[PDB]
Structure 1
Amino acid sequence: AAHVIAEDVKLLQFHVATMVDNELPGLPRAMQKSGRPLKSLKQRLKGKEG
């Protein structure tokens, strides 16, 4: 459909990027449908207790 592909990849981008960084500035955090945001790969090793 050469127009929906654009939205498909925009949402693919959102998912593949919040997999490795859940905190983005100005971007909705990927939450689980319990209501809690995810622990991306960057958070598994970010700060203290990484």
Structure 2
Amino acid sequence: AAHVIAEDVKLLQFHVATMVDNELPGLPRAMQKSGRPLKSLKQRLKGKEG
């Protein structure tokens, strides 16, 4: 379906983007156990204690 493939490419795009940038405006954070999000390659090297 056009809308199903729309959603699945949306999901593949989402996974790549949250792989290099998790904290996006409006979009949900990639989730993980213990109630916390993940940490992307941009958080590894953002600021103090980066």
Give the structure-1-normalised TM-score.
Answer: 0.86
Give the structure with the larger helix fraction. 2
How far apart are residue 34 of structure 1 and its match?
A: 2.9
Q: Which consecutive unaligned segments of at least 5 residues does structure 2 have?
A: none
C-alpha RMSD of the superposition: 1.2
Give the structure-2-normalised TM-score.
Answer: 0.86
How far apart are residue 5 of structure 1 and its match?
A: 1.3
Q: Which consecutive unaligned segments of at least 5 residues does structure 1 have?
A: none
Give the structure with the larger strand fraction. 1
Q: What corresponds to 1:10 in structure 2?
A: 10
Moved runs in structure 1, 4+ residues, more than 6 A? none
